[PDB]
Write a protein that binds this ligand. Sequence first.
Ligand SMILES: O=C(N[C@H](C(=O)N1C[C@@H]2[C@@H](CO)[C@@H]2C1)c1cccc(C(F)(F)F)c1)c1ccccc1-c1ccc(C(F)(F)F)cc1
Lengths: 119, 120
Amino acid sequence: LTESYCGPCPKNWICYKNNCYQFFDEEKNWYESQASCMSQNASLLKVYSKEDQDLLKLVKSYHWMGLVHWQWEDGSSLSPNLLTIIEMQKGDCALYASSFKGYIENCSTPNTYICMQRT
Amino acid sequence: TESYCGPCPKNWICYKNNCYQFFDEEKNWYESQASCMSQNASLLKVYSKEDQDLLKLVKSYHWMGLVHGSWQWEDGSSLSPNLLTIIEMQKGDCALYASSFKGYIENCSTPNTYICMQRT
Ligand SMILES: O=C(N[C@H](C(=O)N1C[C@@H]2[C@@H](CO)[C@@H]2C1)c1cccc(C(F)(F)F)c1)c1ccccc1-c1ccc(C(F)(F)F)cc1
């Protein structure tokens, strides 16, 4: 119940535990989604901690995250005990789904996406 | 442009200086209000489609602080016009939020999930 400020974030982004999130409903392939997040000084969702990102338990549907074949856009590799990766469509990219799941998806398939910023 | 949000408690979502927390354990309206108050909060109050446009993203229906004068919030203020489309669902004196900016009239005794809100 102790209070603190969250961010910094742009005003139209969700802030949770100092990370900033934005949902995009216009569907794009994985590469175009990454390009969109970069154009907003951001990256596709990176999952690094269940505790600091427990809001992701509430994120429904299926959204591009920055995981590719596994490693993140920034070149860091997927840490253990974070995501359950399930095959869906033959491919080298992954969609985030609740709760802490990644569905493998062809990187060229259009999908909604989540971008994430941290300052 | 970057700015700081809140303040909020750590396990709450912050958006445009308001704090939100979803509760998946189903409670009737009265128990839901009591739950938010124990966290120094209230049930969701809807006052602005701009300041609270994240509510367009909320899936399912959840207790908010609107009760039946007219419909009023827990804080005694009136529901502002042209904010919510009110729809009759059950015989009742409480309302559930649903996207986008709908309010379902609901029996206050029906268990539902709920949204607490805080603003320091
Ligand atoms: O609504 C729910 N999940 C959304 C989702 O999965 N979306 C996917 C994508 C749509 C657009 O197609 C977007 C977002 C969601 C998730 C996180 C944050 C938000 C936001 F609201 F903060 F932005 C919205 C949801 C689903 C099941 C149970 C509870 C919720 C829920 C989430 C947050 C809140 C609240 F914030 F009020 F505490 C209340 C209920």
